[PDB]
Design a binder for this molecule. Structure first.
Ligand SMILES: *C(=O)CCCCCCCCCCCCC
Ligand SMILES: [Zn+2]
Lengths: 6, 287
C-alpha cells in the first residue's frame, strides 16, 4: 500500500 | 451543527447525547511521553557508533533488511524500565467500558493500549507493535512473545528462531513498508459508523495515518487534544478550528493527560478515571 513515510 | 459550541464543554454535551454512540480515537506519541516512551519519529528525541548512511535509516526497512544489528542495540538502549499506561490510555479503557469505543487507531508500538485493557478487536496498530514478534522465514513465521524478545535484546544476542535459526523481527512497520491490510479494511468500515473523532497526541505528520482525519463524515465532530495545534490545511501544499466557517473541529492545547482529565471531569467520570488509574498503576508498581 502507500508506504509508511513522514 | 452537532456541537452546540466549539469547546470541550460542547464536545462533552455531544458525548452524553443520543447522537454520539461511536467514538474513534486516533493516537500518537503524545499519549505515551508521560509514560517515559520517546517519540521515535522526532529528530529532536547516540547513533554515530553505527555505520548508518543517514540517521533516519535506523527506522527504514531497506536498511533493516541489510543490517539489523543497529536496530536491536538501539532497542536495548530505548527499552522501557516499566510499562505503565497513562491517564489518556485509561480514558480510552473507560470509553470501552461505557460502550462508546468503536476503534482506537494507534501510531504507537509500545503495547500500552493492550496493557490498559483494549482488546485486539478494539485496536488498529497502524505501525504494528512490540507485543509479538515473528520469524522472518516465509515458510516458518514462528510467533514469539515480548518477554522472549526482551530477553534476546538484553542478552545482546540477535534474536533467532528456535525452529529454523532465521531472524525474529518485532511486529512493527518500518518506514517504507506497507501498513497492515487491517488498517485499510477497518478504515473502510469504521468511518461509515463514526459519531466523534478524538485525535490525541499526534501532529499528524506520518502518512498514511494522517489521511484518517479526511475519512470522517462531514458532520462528525473532531476534537484534538495535543500540546500544539495540528491537522490544518497547509497554506503551501484539514481541521478548521479558528475560521468563521469552523463548525465541528475543536482544539484543546495541553498535555494529553490533562485534556483527558478535563474531558472526564465534564462527563462526570473523574472519580471513575482516578480510581481506574490508581488501581492499575498500583498493580503495575507491585509486579
Ligand atoms: C513507525 O513509526 C514505527 C517506528 C518504530 C520504532 C521503534 C524504535 C525501537 C523501540 C525501542 C523500544 C520500545 C519497544 C517497547
Ligand atoms: Zn523460523
Amino acid at each position: 500500500a502507500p508506504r509508511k513515510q513522514l | 451543527r452537532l456541537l452546540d459550541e466549539l469547546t470541550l464543554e460542547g464536545v462533552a454535551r455531544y458525548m452524553q447525547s443520543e447522537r454520539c454512540r461511536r467514538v474513534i480515537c486516533l493516537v500518537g506519541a503524545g499519549i505515551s511521553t508521560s509514560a517515559g516512551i520517546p517519540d521515535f519519529r522526532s529528530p529532536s528525541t547516540n547513533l554515530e557508533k553505527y555505520h548508518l548512511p543517514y540517521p533516519e535509516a535506523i527506522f527504514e526497512i531497506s536498511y533493516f533488511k541489510k543490517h539489523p544489528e543497529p536496530f536491536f542495540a538501539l532497542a536495548k538502549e530505548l527499552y522501557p524500565g516499566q510499562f505503565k499506561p497513562t491517564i489518556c490510555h485509561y480514558f480510552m479503557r473507560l470509553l470501552k467500558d461505557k460502550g462508546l469505543l468503536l476503534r482506537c487507531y494507534t501510531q504507537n508500538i509500545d503495547t500500552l493500549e493492550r496493557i490498559a485493557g483494549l482488546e485486539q478487536e478494539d485496536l488498529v496498530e497502524a505501525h504494528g507493535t512490540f507485543y509479538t514478534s515473528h520469524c522472518v522465514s516465509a515458510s516458518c513465521r514462528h510467533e514469539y512473545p515480548l518477554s522472549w524478545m526482551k530477553e534476546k535484546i538484553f542478552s545482546e544476542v540477535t534474536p533467532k528462531c528456535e525452529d529454523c535459526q532465521s531472524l525474529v523481527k518485532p511486529d512493527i512497520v518500518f518506514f517504507g513498508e506497507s501498513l497492515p491490510a487491517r488498517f485499510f479494511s477497518c478504515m473502510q468500515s469504521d468511518f461509515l459508523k463514526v459519531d466523534l473523532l478524538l485525535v490525541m497526541g499526534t501532529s499528524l505528520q506520518v502518512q498514511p495515518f494522517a489521511s484518517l482525519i479526511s475519512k470522517a463524515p462531514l458532520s462528525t465532530p473532531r476534537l484534538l487534544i495535543n500540546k500544539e495545534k495540528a491537522g490544518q490545511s497547509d497554506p503551501f501544499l484539514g481541521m478548521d478550528f479558528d475560521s468563521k466557517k469552523a463548525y465541528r473541529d475543536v482544539a484543546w492545547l495541553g498535555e494529553c493527560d490533562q485534556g483527558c482529565l478535563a474531558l472526564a471531569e465534564l462527563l462526570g467520570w473523574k472519580k471513575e478515571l482516578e480510581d481506574l488509574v490508581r488501581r492499575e498503576h498500583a498493580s503495575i508498581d507491585a509486579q
